[PDB]
Amino acid sequence: YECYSDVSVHEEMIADQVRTEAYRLGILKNWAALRGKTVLDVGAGTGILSIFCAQAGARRVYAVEASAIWQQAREVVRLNGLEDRVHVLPGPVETVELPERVDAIVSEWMGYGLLHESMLSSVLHARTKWLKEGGLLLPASAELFVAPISDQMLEWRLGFWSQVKQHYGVDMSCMESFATRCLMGHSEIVVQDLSGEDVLARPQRFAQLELARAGLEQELEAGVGGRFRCSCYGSAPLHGFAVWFQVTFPGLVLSTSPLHPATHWKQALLYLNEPVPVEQDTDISGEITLLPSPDNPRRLRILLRYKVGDHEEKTKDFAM
Amino acid sequence: TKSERDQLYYECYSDVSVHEEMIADQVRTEAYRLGILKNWAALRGKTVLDVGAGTGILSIFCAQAGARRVYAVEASAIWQQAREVVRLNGLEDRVHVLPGPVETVELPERVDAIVSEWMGYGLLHESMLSSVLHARTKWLKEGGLLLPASAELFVAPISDQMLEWRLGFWSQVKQHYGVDMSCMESFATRCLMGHSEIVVQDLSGEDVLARPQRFAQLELARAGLEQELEAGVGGRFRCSCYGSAPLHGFAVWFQVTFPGGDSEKPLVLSTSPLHPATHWKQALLYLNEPVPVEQDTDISGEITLLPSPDNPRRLRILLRYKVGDHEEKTKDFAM
Ligand SMILES: COC(=O)c1cc(O)c2cc(NC(=O)NCCCNC(=N)NC[C@H]3O[C@@H](n4cnc5c(N)ncnc54)[C@H](O)[C@@H]3O)ccc2c1
Ligand SMILES: COC(=O)c1cc(O)c2cc(NC(=O)NCCCNC(=N)NC[C@H]3O[C@@H](n4cnc5c(N)ncnc54)[C@H](O)[C@@H]3O)ccc2c1
């Protein structure tokens, strides 16, 4: 609340050009389906996505926002001359009273690793309560991807200590083992921007989330995930796995893949305890599950099961 | 709590990342290498205490400068890595890594010199200075050498171009996305400037609105500097603005000066925005909102660096300032 009552989080979101342009186009390209229709904007923030919906031809937009920024959104709507058809309503979408069920829901709800501190549950609540049967969901689905990685930045950080002798005339190569323990031997999910160079095998879709589904909400508690299998491109040190997501609008995709333009979500990196050598065509299989943490269900936990080539299957249990 | 804070600092400095950042700070690490090796005449055949030796690199520089013995005292678990580094370089007969706080370590004799990289953000946020002064009183010989010997504090008024971009962001949305959000400028200003937090951020020379002013100096050898720290380190300043600009506040930074070399041109490690960047950046003190100023507008005031009442190591800065003929104002900041 203090967070989304403050400008910084909203500036960061809008300044994510990939994100904001993708939502903009995802809405404006659905003009045929929004023309003369009503929309609920779940967690409307500053109101910018609600105004795109108006530009796409919506006859009415209900912009519901729980934090104090709703005051700024009301100002923005007025300043843009849309108070006749964009209505900012304060408070949680779970208690808000709309005058009618709506033809469409728009929302930007995704967190790091898709589900860390996300507002998905509020979007599903609004879907059940306020979306007419078969209504438009913008976006309508989320797809989760995994790929094994060789992280170039990690390699640079591990190899830093062997370059001190050249910078300052003091040998510190012995610190590589320690650096590896510190940077890989923890059980934290690391949020970091990867490059396409870092991807060691074809990315694998391992789960899908269909936001229209009644029951998705209770499904999340047991975990979202599934198996994967891939074959490595070439020789490299395997450092672990990257997890990322995309969301799909009814007909456009907003991707957070390392192979696509960077976004503020970056990727979620799952490091093994130490590098593992892989060669071309090394087979890697496993399972990834996104789970709520025991102490706080907003906090993301990822359980990783993996098998590299012939080696024994191993597991690592990560938390944000 | 103080126990929780001590544990967090221990875990931080037992981990690689903070040491990677410090050694990768070439401005910092080169300045200490040069300031030490420049003092070879004073260190040849002498004993050195390195307060908070980390991975040991500065203790090794002292050995390379000709010291006969270096005691490298390090409180966090990184002392084990320092031991390995010293052994790797063939120096463990001269450089002795000793675990624990310098306040309770035992050395076989008072030493000829102390070396330490103790500085925090805004100089005194979470710094090791109290530990260096403790070591000086307890282990430094009379007339011994302190490297660096002093710290100096500087201030300059700023028009922060990054801040202006953040404040103007909302007026720019319409050109990119077709939605007018100009009405959020006031909100953005209250959020970004109306707080009382010290902001640590890199500034550029272009952000500097008047000649920087030195407002305090700390001479590490002064037995009595400890009392000055609780009462507040600071001083007064006056500058004249270069040109028209929105005044956003003040930037505070430091330098440390090493003994030896040219008596009139000592070696200095600076964190000024006018000089190459360091990991310490600068400490920015924003006014509640921008103040228009003109060429030759006078700005004067007083800046005091203080301990936070509930954490002596959390930096508090008291700013008293007067812009032109405006009434004098005050703002109290904390890290
Ligand atoms: C009385 O209760 C409160 O005021 C409240 C309580 C919470 O637990 C919140 C927890 C929060 N955390 C997240 O949203 N984390 C997800 C990460 C991505 N976030 C995102 N892009 N959000 C966009 C906007 O959505 C609003 N928003 C969130 N939840 C609801 C809801 N149920 N009804 C209406 N608006 C809602 C937020 O205020 C943002 O402007 C945020 C706000 C919250 C507000
Ligand atoms: C058992 O350890 C604890 O309980 C503990 C408690 C603290 O309050 C600490 C508080 C800490 N905060 C700072 O270090 N702040 C200074 C600002 C920048 N950091 C820096 N340049 N430090 C260099 C190294 O110095 C070591 N170091 C710090 N204090 C002492 C001391 N009294 N004796 C010997 N070594 C010491 C550190 O472990 C670092 O490697 C760190 C560690 C700390 C450790």
Side-chain angles (χ1 to χ4, degrees):
Chain A
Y1 172 92
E2 250 199 351
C3 197
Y4 297 100
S5 272
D6 173 87
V7 65
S8 286
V9 72
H10 299 290
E11 172 185 350
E12 173 175 37
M13 288 327 114
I14 292 166
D16 183 340
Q17 189 267 332
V18 172
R19 167 217 180 255
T20 301
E21 196 53 56
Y23 264 85
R24 184 169 172 283
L25 294 189
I27 290 157
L28 291 179
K29 274 191 199 273
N30 270 285
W31 65 272
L34 290 170
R35 179 138 181 131
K37 304 284 180 47
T38 60
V39 182
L40 166 61
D41 182 357
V42 175
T46 65
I48 192 173
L49 297 187
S50 287
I51 295 175
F52 298 148
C53 285
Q55 293 183 325
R59 72 186 167 78
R60 195 144 336 273
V61 184
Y62 297 108
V64 176
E65 166 58 45
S67 89
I69 199 93
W70 74 262
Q71 303 183 93
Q72 309 311 311
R74 187 152 83 180
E75 283 173 25
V76 173
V77 167
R78 207 209 56 80
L79 165 67
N80 285 271
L82 289 167
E83 79 152 59
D84 67 300
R85 44 202 226 260
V86 180
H87 315 292
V88 176
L89 306 173
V93 76
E94 290 88 351
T95 53
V96 76
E97 280 314 299
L98 305 183
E100 61 196 309
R101 297 198 304 161
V102 294
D103 298 298
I105 278 173
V106 61
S107 178
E108 205 278 271
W109 50 268
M110 293 89 71
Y112 296 107
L114 188 67
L115 298 174
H116 178 71
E117 301 208 302
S118 88
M119 58 184 307
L120 178 61
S121 283
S122 300
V123 173
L124 305 177
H125 194 282
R127 203 282 319 158
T128 306
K129 196 167 180 190
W130 295 112
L131 185 69
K132 304 191 178 154
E133 286 76 22
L136 197 71
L137 279 158
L138 305 170
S141 66
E143 298 74 44
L144 282 156
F145 292 85
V146 62
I149 59 171
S150 197
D151 178 351
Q152 299 323 293
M153 176 60 48
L154 180 55
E155 276 274 296
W156 180 90
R157 290 191 72 191
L158 292 175
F160 178 81
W161 298 101
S162 290
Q163 294 291 132
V164 172
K165 190 158 46 163
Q166 282 63 24
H167 302 326
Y168 303 115
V170 175
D171 200 346
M172 303 192 70
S173 64
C174 53
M175 290 211 26
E176 207 176 89
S177 308
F178 169 75
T180 304
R181 291 194 290 280
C182 293
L183 294 182
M184 314 191 57
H186 58 82
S187 289
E188 298 170 38
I189 299 170
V190 171
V191 172
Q192 198 222 281
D193 253 325
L194 285 188
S195 153
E197 316 175 50
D198 300 310
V199 170
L200 294 180
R202 192 177 172 190
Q204 306 291 315
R205 188 178 73 192
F206 67 90
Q208 289 178 81
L209 287 82
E210 190 73 33
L211 299 196
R213 293 188 58 240
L216 178 52
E217 223 287 290
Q218 311 288 18
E219 281 199 21
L220 299 162
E221 285 65 32
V224 172
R227 300 177 153 220
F228 69 91
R229 200 180 281 286
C230 57
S231 317
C232 291
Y233 285 151
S235 299
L238 174 75
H239 296 131
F241 301 85
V243 170
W244 67 84
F245 63 90
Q246 65 183 37
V247 294
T248 300
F249 295 84
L252 192 132
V253 168
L254 170 56
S255 181
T256 63
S257 169
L259 300 177
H260 297 152
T263 77
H264 80 278
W265 288 285
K266 302 175 190 313
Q267 292 88 44
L269 303 195
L270 305 184
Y271 291 131
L272 308 180
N273 288 339
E274 58 274 305
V276 175
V278 299
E279 319 208 64
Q280 190 173 264
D281 291 329
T282 295
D283 296 307
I284 300 176
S285 73
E287 182 160 16
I288 298 176
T289 317
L290 279 65
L291 293 143
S293 275
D295 53 314
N296 167 6
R298 312 257 65 191
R299 172 185 209 230
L300 181 65
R301 173 205 171 188
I302 289 175
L303 199 44
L304 171 71
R305 172 176 83 41
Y306 68 97
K307 186 167 149 260
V308 180
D310 284 334
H311 314 147
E312 184 227 45
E313 187 164 271
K314 288 134 109 173
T315 63
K316 194 158 166 177
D317 193 332
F318 301 88
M320 197 58 80
Chain B
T1 83
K2 197 222 190 303
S3 292
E4 295 172 323
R5 284 193 263 110
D6 289 339
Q7 187 59 14
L8 284 177
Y9 286 87
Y10 174 84
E11 309 183 332
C12 179
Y13 286 91
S14 306
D15 171 81
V16 68
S17 293
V18 73
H19 297 289
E20 180 183 347
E21 183 184 33
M22 280 185 284
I23 297 174
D25 186 337
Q26 184 168 311
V27 180
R28 164 217 184 259
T29 303
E30 269 294 87
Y32 268 80
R33 184 175 192 255
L34 282 173
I36 288 161
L37 299 156
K38 198 134 154 273
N39 270 283
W40 68 267
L43 292 175
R44 158 177 56 181
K46 301 304 195 354
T47 62
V48 182
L49 170 60
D50 182 357
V51 183
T55 62
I57 187 172
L58 305 180
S59 285
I60 294 172
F61 290 158
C62 289
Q64 285 173 343
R68 165 193 100 61
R69 179 145 281 181
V70 187
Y71 300 100
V73 180
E74 169 56 43
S76 79
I78 201 72
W79 76 261
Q80 297 180 111
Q81 280 60 56
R83 179 193 47 201
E84 277 179 37
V85 167
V86 168
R87 167 65 185 217
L88 188 70
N89 287 273
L91 286 170
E92 81 272 12
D93 180 77
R94 275 174 275 166
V95 180
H96 301 300
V97 174
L98 296 174
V102 77
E103 288 88 348
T104 62
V105 75
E106 283 290 332
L107 312 176
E109 192 185 351
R110 280 182 175 272
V111 295
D112 298 289
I114 287 171
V115 65
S116 184
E117 198 281 88
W118 49 265
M119 296 83 74
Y121 299 105
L123 188 68
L124 296 177
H125 181 62
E126 282 310 348
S127 92
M128 278 201 293
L129 182 60
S130 67
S131 298
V132 170
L133 304 182
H134 186 288
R136 180 218 39 205
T137 305
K138 190 169 159 171
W139 292 113
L140 190 65
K141 289 181 186 171
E142 271 284 311
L145 186 74
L146 283 158
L147 294 74
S150 68
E152 294 76 48
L153 286 162
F154 292 82
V155 65
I158 55 171
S159 205
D160 181 342
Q161 297 291 246
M162 177 63 33
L163 181 59
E164 211 95 80
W165 178 99
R166 288 194 76 194
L167 293 179
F169 179 93
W170 300 104
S171 296
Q172 285 317 285
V173 174
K174 187 155 202 217
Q175 296 93 287
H176 298 85
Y177 297 115
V179 176
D180 193 345
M181 300 177 93
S182 283
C183 57
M184 287 180 68
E185 182 146 337
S186 287
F187 167 74
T189 305
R190 305 195 274 286
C191 289
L192 294 206
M193 301 185 77
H195 59 81
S196 294
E197 304 193 20
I198 304 173
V199 173
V200 177
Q201 164 187 321
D202 259 312
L203 287 178
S204 37
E206 278 317 80
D207 306 297
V208 172
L209 291 201
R211 178 176 274 141
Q213 304 295 308
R214 184 184 120 166
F215 69 90
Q217 186 171 234
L218 309 188
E219 272 287 340
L220 267 43
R222 300 256 153 203
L225 175 58
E226 307 104 272
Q227 222 185 126
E228 303 170 25
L229 290 178
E230 211 97 69
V233 167
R236 287 153 177 209
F237 66 93
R238 180 181 181 78
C239 56
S240 193
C241 289
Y242 291 146
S244 323
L247 174 75
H248 296 137
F250 300 90
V252 171
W253 67 85
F254 63 91
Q255 70 185 25
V256 292
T257 302
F258 290 83
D262 183 337
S263 81
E264 302 186 78
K265 268 134 181 83
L267 169 70
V268 173
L269 166 54
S270 167
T271 60
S272 170
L274 296 181
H275 293 154
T278 81
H279 83 277
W280 284 286
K281 303 183 199 293
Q282 291 88 33
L284 308 192
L285 308 173
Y286 291 143
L287 307 190
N288 283 350
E289 58 279 311
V291 174
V293 300
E294 314 226 85
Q295 190 166 354
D296 297 343
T297 296
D298 297 323
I299 304 190
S300 66
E302 184 161 357
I303 288 165
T304 310
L305 280 63
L306 291 151
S308 275
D310 267 330
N311 181 357
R313 295 289 261 271
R314 179 194 199 211
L315 183 61
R316 166 180 180 221
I317 288 168
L318 187 74
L319 174 70
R320 174 167 72 83
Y321 69 95
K322 184 179 184 312
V323 175
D325 74 21
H326 297 335
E327 64 187 333
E328 171 191 295
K329 282 150 191 133
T330 72
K331 184 158 175 176
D332 195 324
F333 303 82
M335 189 72 61

